[PDB]
Amino acid sequence: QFIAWL
């Protein structure tokens, strides 16, 4: 998975 929280 690809997960991002900016």
Author numbering: 1 to 6
The publication says:
Here, we identify an evolutionarily conserved hexapeptide sequence as the major aggregation-prone region (APR) of gastrointestinal peptides of the glucagon family: xFxxWL. We determine nine polymorphic crystal structures of the APR segments of glucagon-like peptides 1 and 2, and exendin and its derivatives. We propose that the pH-dependent changes of the protonation states of glutamate/aspartate residues of APRs initiate switching between the amyloid and the folded, monomeric forms of the hormones. Our results highlight the dual role of short aggregation core motifs in reversible amyloid formation and receptor binding.
Crystals of APRGLP1 grew only at a low pH (pH ≈ 2, T = 37 °C) where the N-terminal glutamic acid self-converted to a pyroglutamic acid (pE) via a spontaneous ring closure. In the structure of APRGLP1 the hydrophobic residues (Phe, Ile, Ala, Leu) form a hydrophobic core, while Trp and pGlu participate in H-bonding with each other and water molecules. In the crystal structure of pEFIAWL, the ring-closure of an N-terminal Glu residue (resulting in the formation of pyroglutamic acid) makes the N-terminal more hydrophobic by eliminating the charge frustrations linked to both the Glu side chain and the protonated N-terminal amine. The crystal structure of APRGLP1 provide an example where pyroglutamic acid built in a β-spine amyloid nanostructure can be studied. Based on our current results, we propose that the elimination of the charges by ring closure, significantly contributes to self-assembly, compared to sole side chain protonation of Glu. This might also be the reason why we observed the presence of pEFIAWL in the crystal state while the parent hexapeptide, EFIAWL, did not crystallize despite forming amyloid. The five-membered ring structure of pGlu shows similar geometry to that of Pro, which is considered a formidable β-sheet breaker. Thus, cyclic pGlu with quasi-fixed dihedrals would be expected to function as a gatekeeper of amyloid formation by twisting the backbone structures away from that of typical β-strands. However, the example of the crystal structure of pEFIAWL provides compelling evidence that a Pro-like residue right next to an APR does not necessarily prevent β-stranded amyloid formation. The glucagon-like APRs (APRGLP2 and APRGLP1) show an extensive contact surface (Sc = ~0.80; Area = ~160 Å2) along the extended, linear backbone of high complementarity, while exendin-like sequences (APRex-4 and APRTc5b) present generally smaller values (Sc = ~0.65; Area = ~110 Å2).
